[PDB]
Design an enzyme around this catalytic site. Sequence first.
Site, PDB file in Angstrom:
ATOM      1  N   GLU A   8      27.186  -3.878  -6.997  1.00 19.33           N
ATOM      2  CA  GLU A   8      27.240  -4.523  -5.917  1.00 19.33           C
ATOM      3  C   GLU A   8      26.553  -5.396  -6.139  1.00 19.33           C
ATOM      4  OE1 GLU A   8      27.398  -2.033  -1.708  1.00 19.33           O
ATOM      5  OE2 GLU A   8      26.867  -4.286  -0.831  1.00 19.33           O
TER       6      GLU A   8
ATOM      7  N   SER B 237      28.022  -3.783   7.358  1.00 18.02           N
ATOM      8  CA  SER B 237      28.284  -3.043   8.492  1.00 18.02           C
ATOM      9  C   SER B 237      26.694  -2.452   8.581  1.00 18.02           C
ATOM     10  CB  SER B 237      29.107  -1.877   7.987  1.00 18.02           C
ATOM     11  OG  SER B 237      30.318  -1.790   6.816  1.00 18.02           O
TER      12      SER B 237
ATOM     13  N   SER C 248      21.846  -4.972   3.402  1.00 17.00           N
ATOM     14  CA  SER C 248      20.575  -5.229   2.292  1.00 17.00           C
ATOM     15  C   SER C 248      19.717  -6.668   2.352  1.00 17.00           C
ATOM     16  CB  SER C 248      21.271  -5.250   1.132  1.00 17.00           C
ATOM     17  OG  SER C 248      22.414  -4.004   1.209  1.00 17.00           O
TER      18      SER C 248
ATOM     19  N   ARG D  12      16.776  -4.724  -5.528  1.00 17.21           N
ATOM     20  CA  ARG D  12      16.697  -4.576  -3.445  1.00 17.21           C
ATOM     21  C   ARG D  12      15.597  -4.599  -3.118  1.00 17.21           C
ATOM     22  NH1 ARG D  12      17.959  -0.411   0.469  1.00 17.21           N
ATOM     23  NH2 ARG D  12      19.297  -1.111   1.656  1.00 17.21           N
TER      24      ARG D  12
HETATM   25  N1  LIG Z   1      38.090  -8.861  10.982  1.00 14.13           N
HETATM   26  C1  LIG Z   1      36.694  -8.208  11.337  1.00 14.13           C
HETATM   27  N2  LIG Z   1      36.769  -6.912  11.298  1.00 14.13           N
HETATM   28  C2  LIG Z   1      35.946  -6.100  11.335  1.00 14.13           C
HETATM   29  N3  LIG Z   1      34.636  -6.437  11.438  1.00 14.13           N
HETATM   30  C3  LIG Z   1      34.848  -8.177  11.165  1.00 14.13           C
HETATM   31  C4  LIG Z   1      35.249  -8.926  11.352  1.00 14.13           C
HETATM   32  N4  LIG Z   1      34.164 -10.135  11.049  1.00 14.13           N
HETATM   33  C5  LIG Z   1      33.327  -9.449  10.763  1.00 14.13           C
HETATM   34  N5  LIG Z   1      33.135  -8.769  11.109  1.00 14.13           N
HETATM   35  C6  LIG Z   1      32.087  -8.273  11.300  1.00 14.13           C
HETATM   36  O1  LIG Z   1      31.320  -8.050   8.744  1.00 14.13           O
HETATM   37  C7  LIG Z   1      31.310  -6.699   9.583  1.00 14.13           C
HETATM   38  C8  LIG Z   1      31.236  -6.084   8.038  1.00 14.13           C
HETATM   39  O2  LIG Z   1      30.915  -7.097   7.189  1.00 14.13           O
HETATM   40  P1  LIG Z   1      31.179  -6.992   5.698  1.00 14.13           P
HETATM   41  O3  LIG Z   1      29.902  -7.794   4.872  1.00 14.13           O
HETATM   42  O4  LIG Z   1      32.873  -7.061   4.784  1.00 14.13           O
HETATM   43  O5  LIG Z   1      31.003  -5.176   5.169  1.00 14.13           O
HETATM   44  P2  LIG Z   1      31.206  -4.355   5.145  1.00 14.13           P
HETATM   45  O6  LIG Z   1      30.992  -4.719   2.889  1.00 14.13           O
HETATM   46  O7  LIG Z   1      30.281  -3.245   4.688  1.00 14.13           O
HETATM   47  O8  LIG Z   1      32.771  -3.904   4.619  1.00 14.13           O
HETATM   48  C9  LIG Z   1      31.454  -5.913  10.850  1.00 14.13           C
HETATM   49  O9  LIG Z   1      30.496  -5.165  10.956  1.00 14.13           O
HETATM   50  C10 LIG Z   1      31.556  -6.952  11.809  1.00 14.13           C
HETATM   51  O10 LIG Z   1      30.597  -7.142  11.823  1.00 14.13           O
HETATM   52  C1  LIG Z   2      24.978   1.450   1.835  1.00 15.54           C
HETATM   53  C2  LIG Z   2      24.712  -0.332   1.797  1.00 15.54           C
HETATM   54  C3  LIG Z   2      25.191  -1.373   0.485  1.00 15.54           C
HETATM   55  C4  LIG Z   2      26.204  -0.538   2.431  1.00 15.54           C
HETATM   56  O1  LIG Z   2      26.959  -1.457   1.984  1.00 15.54           O
HETATM   57  P1  LIG Z   2      28.158  -2.059   2.096  1.00 15.54           P
HETATM   58  O2  LIG Z   2      28.932  -1.764   3.121  1.00 15.54           O
HETATM   59  O3  LIG Z   2      27.253  -2.174   4.206  1.00 15.54           O
HETATM   60  O4  LIG Z   2      28.247  -3.898   2.034  1.00 15.54           O
HETATM   61  C5  LIG Z   2      24.215  -1.450   3.084  1.00 15.54           C
HETATM   62  O5  LIG Z   2      25.227  -0.657   4.755  1.00 15.54           O
HETATM   63  C6  LIG Z   2      22.628  -1.248   3.344  1.00 15.54           C
HETATM   64  O6  LIG Z   2      21.706  -1.159   2.602  1.00 15.54           O
HETATM   65  N1  LIG Z   2      22.527  -0.428   5.051  1.00 15.54           N
HETATM   66  C7  LIG Z   2      21.341  -0.099   5.111  1.00 15.54           C
HETATM   67  C8  LIG Z   2      20.609   0.761   4.462  1.00 15.54           C
HETATM   68  C9  LIG Z   2      18.881   1.788   4.249  1.00 15.54           C
HETATM   69  O7  LIG Z   2      18.519   0.663   3.434  1.00 15.54           O
HETATM   70  O8  LIG Z   2      18.458   2.346   4.457  1.00 15.54           O
HETATM   71 MG   LIG Z   3      29.493  -5.421   1.368  1.00 16.23          MG
END
Ligand SMILES: Nc1ncnc2c1ncn2[C@@H]1O[C@H](COP(=O)(O)OP(=O)(O)O)[C@@H](O)[C@H]1O
Ligand SMILES: CC(C)(COP(=O)(O)O)[C@@H](O)C(=O)NCCC(=O)O
Ligand SMILES: [Mg+2]
EC number: 2.7.1.33
Lengths: 355, 355
Positions: free
Chosen positions: B124, B178, B181, B193
Site C-alpha cells: 500500500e 478509514s 497513516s 511509515r
Molecule cells: N462516497 C464516499 N463513501 C464513503 N466514504 C467516503 C466517501 N467520500 C469520502 N469518504 C470518506 O473517505 C474515507 C475513506 O477514504 P479512503 O482513502 O478511500 O479510505 P480507505 O482506503 O480506507 O477505503 C471515508 O472514511 C469517508 O470519510
Molecule cells: C490500517 C490502515 C493502513 C488501513 O488503510 P486504509 O484502509 O485506512 O486506507 C489505516 O487504517 C491505518 O493506518 N490506521 C491507523 C492504525 C494505527 O496506526 O493505530
Molecule cells: Mg486507503
Amino acid sequence: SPWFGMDIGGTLVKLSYFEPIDITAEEEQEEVESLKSIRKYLTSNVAYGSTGIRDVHLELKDLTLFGRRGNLHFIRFPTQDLPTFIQMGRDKNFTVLCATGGGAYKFEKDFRTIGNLHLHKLDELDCLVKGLLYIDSVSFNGQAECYYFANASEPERCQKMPFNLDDPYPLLVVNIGSGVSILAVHSKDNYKRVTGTSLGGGTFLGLCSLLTGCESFEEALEMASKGDSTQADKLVRDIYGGDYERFGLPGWAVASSFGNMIYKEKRESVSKEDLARATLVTITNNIGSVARMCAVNEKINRVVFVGNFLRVNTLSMKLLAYALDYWSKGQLKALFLEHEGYFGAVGALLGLPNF
Amino acid sequence: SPWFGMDIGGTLVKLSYFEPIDITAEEEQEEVESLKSIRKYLTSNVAYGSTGIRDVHLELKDLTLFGRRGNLHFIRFPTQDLPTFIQMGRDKNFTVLCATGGGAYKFEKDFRTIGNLHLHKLDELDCLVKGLLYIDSVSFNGQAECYYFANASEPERCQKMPFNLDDPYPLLVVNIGSGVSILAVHSKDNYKRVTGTSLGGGTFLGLCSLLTGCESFEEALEMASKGDSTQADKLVRDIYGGDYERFGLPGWAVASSFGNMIYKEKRESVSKEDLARATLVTITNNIGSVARMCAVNEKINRVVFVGNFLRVNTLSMKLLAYALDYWSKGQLKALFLEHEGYFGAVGALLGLPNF
Ligand SMILES: Nc1ncnc2c1ncn2[C@@H]1O[C@H](COP(=O)(O)OP(=O)(O)O)[C@@H](O)[C@H]1O
Ligand SMILES: CC(C)(COP(=O)(O)O)[C@@H](O)C(=O)NCCC(=O)O
Ligand SMILES: [Mg+2]
Ligand SMILES: Nc1ncnc2c1ncn2[C@@H]1O[C@H](COP(=O)(O)OP(=O)(O)O)[C@@H](O)[C@H]1O
Ligand SMILES: CC(C)(COP(=O)(O)O)[C@@H](O)C(=O)NCCC(=O)O
Ligand SMILES: [Mg+2]
C-alpha cells in the site's frame, strides 16, 4: 484563617485543606467561633451539600507544613456548583485563598463578594508541578505516591507496583482533565507546556452521554466495563483479513475508531455498553499515542498521567500502560499517582507564604 | 488485457484504468469482443451499477504510459460492493490485475474465482508514493497537481493556489482514509511509515451517523456546513472567561471537544448540524495536531494530505491549512492534491511491467 488551596477546573473544583492538629490550649480557647465552625464542618462530614465529596482515603496525616503539624484533606465538587459554595461562603457567620485553574480567572469577581477574602491567583502549570513534586517527596503516608503496571503487556502478570521518583527529571506530565495538557519538566525550575489535545475526559464524557444517555462519569465507566469496543471499531483484520505485518500492525489493532458504525446494520446491533467502551478506548489510545510522540520528541522516557479522567478508571490506566509499553518496545514507562486530580490544589496551597 | 490498477480500502475501492487511444486499424479489427466490450462500458458510462462512479473531472487525457498514448480514468465504489463487481467479472463473456490496499489480501481468494486472471499484490505505501510522485510529475493536464491555501490564517485573503513539487523531498504524507497513516518520504527510494491514528474518516462518518442519523458522507458534510461546533465544544473562554495567554491559547480555541455535552441542558439544545460540525472539527484538528507533531519530529516542513476524507471537503482542508499555519508560525505548509484518493490505484497500475 483557614489554609486552603483551590484548583478550579472546567469540570471539577479541587480543594486541599490543611487541618492543624497541634492546636494549643490557648489557641483553641482564643479561636474565632466561625473559624472553629469551618474546621468542624469539614472534618465531621464526608459529603458536603449534594455534590461535595471528601476523598478520605487520600488524606495525608501528621504532615508538617508551614511549621505546623496537621492533616491534608482533599475535597472535590463540580465547578457548576461553585456559586453555591460561594453563597455559603458569604454566610453571615464568617482569610486568604490561593486559587489556580481557568476558574481562578473566570470567577475572580465572584470570590471578591466575600468581604473578608483576599484572592491570589497562581498559574495552573506552576501549581501542578510544585504539587506533584511535593506530594511525591512527602510520600503517601509512607507508601509510594507513584506507581506503574509491571508487565503491562502480559495479562496474567500485569499488576500495580510502586515506582520511585527520587530523581524525577526529566519528566513528561500528561494532565487529562476536560482537555489534555502535556508538560515537559526538566528540573524544578525549567518546565514547559509542549502540546495538548482537546480530546480529553470531557470528550469521553460528552460523547458517551450523547451516545448512551449515561448520567455520570461512574455510570459511563461501568457501562464501558461491560462493552466490547470491537463491535463499533473497525480492526486491522476487518480490512486486511489478518495482520498488516509489513508495518507491524497486528490484526486486532484498531484501524478506524467507530469505523464499523458507517454500516446501518452494525449501528443497529451495537449496544450502549459497546459504544461506552469504544468511546473510552478511542479517547484513551489517542492520548497515549500523542503522549508517546511527545516523549520520543522530548527524549523523555518517564510519562506521568494525572488529572481526574483516570480516577476510578483502571481500564484507561491499563490501556495507557499497555500502549506506551508496546509501541516503545519497553523504553517508555507509563506512571500514575494516587493523588491524581489534586496536584494543582496542593501547589496552590503551597503558594501561601508568598502572600 | 485491460490495464487496471486497484486500491481496495477499508471503505472504498479505487480503480485506475488506462484507455488506449492510439488503437491502430489492425488492432481494432483483431480486438477480442469481450475486451472491446469492457472498453465501451467503462467509457460510455459515468455511473456503474448503483454505486460505481467515474470521476470524469480527474481524467488525465493523452498520457503516454508503457509506450502507448491513452487516457487515465478514475473510478470508485464501496468495498461492500466488491462481490458484485467480481460476480460481473465472471460474466461468461470474459488479464492481469495489480492490487493494493488491505483488500488485496482480504479478497485475494475471491479474485481468483475469475479464471482468466492473475492477481499481483503490491504494498500500500509503495503504491501511494509511486502514484503521488507520478501524477505530480505528469501534471494535471498541464495544471499543478498540488495546491495549498495562501494566507490560510486570513479569511478575506484565503484562496487556493498552485504549489510546485519539482523537488518534493523531504515530504510528510498524511493519508486520511478509514484510518490515518503518516509517511515520511526522504527520497523516491527511502520512505517509512512514522505513525498513524485510528481517528480517521471512518471515525467522522461513524460518529456522525450515530449522532445525527446521516445516511452518507455527503449528507454529513452538508449537515456540518450548517452547524456551529461551539455549541458542543467547550472553549478556552468557557473555562478561563477569556484567553489563557501565558501559554498562547486564545479564548476561541477548543479546550475540550464535545466538552459542553456533559450538561443535560446543552445536549438538549444542540442540533444535529452542530454535532456534525463538532465531529468534523474534532477529527480534523486532531489529525492536524498529530501531523504537526510528526513534521516537527521528522524535521519536514511540507505536509501533503491525501485520502478520500478530504474529497468535496473544503472545510477540513481549510481547518488543516489554518492549523498547520497557526501553530507553526508559518513554517509548516499544508499541501493538497487533486487526485487525493487515487494514488494507490495509480501506483498499483504502474507496477504492471513487473509481471
Ligand atoms: N462516497 C464516499 N463513501 C464513503 N466514504 C467516503 C466517501 N467520500 C469520502 N469518504 C470518506 O473517505 C474515507 C475513506 O477514504 P479512503 O482513502 O478511500 O479510505 P480507505 O482506503 O480506507 O477505503 C471515508 O472514511 C469517508 O470519510
Ligand atoms: C490500517 C490502515 C493502513 C488501513 O488503510 P486504509 O484502509 O485506512 O486506507 C489505516 O487504517 C491505518 O493506518 N490506521 C491507523 C492504525 C494505527 O496506526 O493505530
Ligand atoms: Mg486507503
Ligand atoms: N465525579 C466526576 N464528575 C465529573 N467528571 C469526572 C468525575 N470523575 C472523573 N471525571 C472525569 O475527570 C475529568 C475532569 O478532570 P479534571 O482534572 O478535574 O478536569 P478539570 O481541571 O478540567 O476540571 C472529567 O472530564 C471526567 O472525564
Ligand atoms: C485549556 C486547558 C489548559 C484547561 O485546563 P483544564 O480545565 O482541562 O484542567 C486544557 O483543557 C487544555 O490544554 N486543552 C487542550 C487545548 C489545546 O491544546 O488545543
Ligand atoms: Mg485541571
